[PDB]
Design a protein around this ligand. Structure first.
Ligand SMILES: Cc1onc(-c2ccccc2)c1CO
Lengths: 138, 141
């Protein structure tokens, strides 16, 4: 399960957020982009794979995955194509106040989501789960 | 020393590459930006700090770091900003030169070069890559 990611889209304030969730830990990355395009997705995946060892992404059916540029990026990076963010809507809502731009609220919420300890003393954050899973794997 | 990151910039084809180096591992993260503004740096650091446990940052003390926007982002994320504290730039431009022909746009070749830097075995076949060192270094349990 170490290299499996889920990628999905969300539309807010007539704008687009790509969210990737590392499935075994619930760790996320997100970015706001103007539109859900092949180019934008492919750049996103390339960033992702250069940072974590991505093996497989699960995506929705959308055209932005079928593009020639996304397939070239996947081939180049060795990625094979095949709810956790409902919390991210919520966190985006709780911090919307604290910033002018959406892209800033998005990133603040990613920070909050990844650093938040689940459970009591002895708990782990998503950020800690992902690094532990990967370290263990090696 | 595990939460220390150095920030740096490099220029190419007349655009700004913002680079974050994890000091103890060599792991790099990088984005191409329109210009070295307060806002673009703050946005960069905030994305960084949401992805890794960023305790400290060293800067070249460029003017984008003296901006209130950056200092306010560091604050929010609990990062200690350390301006003026002393290449990767050369090694990265050379890797960029090797993949440059495979990408329409610079930004894309930047992420390809980051990927290659992070996956490269350092030393012999018995060794480990930057991507491997950082997780090993950062893993708490
Ligand atoms: C080989 C290999 O196997 N896993 C990784 C890796 C890459 C990025 C982050 C963490 C691990 C690598 C290269 O860095």
């Amino acid at each position: 399960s170490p290299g499996i990611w889920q990628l999905d889209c969300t539309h807010l304030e007539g704008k687009v957020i790509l969210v990737a969730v590392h499935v075994a830990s619930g760790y996320i990355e997100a970015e706001v982009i103007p539109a859900e395009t092949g180019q934008e997705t492919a750049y996103f995946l390339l960033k992702l794979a250069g940072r974590w060892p991505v093996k497989t992404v699960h995506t929705d059916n959308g055209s932005n995955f079928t593009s020639t540029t996304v397939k070239a990026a996947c081939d180049w990076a060795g990625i094979k194509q095949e709810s956790m963010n409902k919390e991210l809507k919520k966190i985006i809502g709780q911090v919307r106040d604290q910033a002018e731009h959406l892209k800033t609220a998005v990133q603040m919420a990613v920070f909050i989501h990844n650093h938040k300890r689940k459970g009591g003393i002895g708990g782990y954050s998503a950020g800690e789960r992902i690094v532990d899973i990967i370290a263990t794997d090696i």
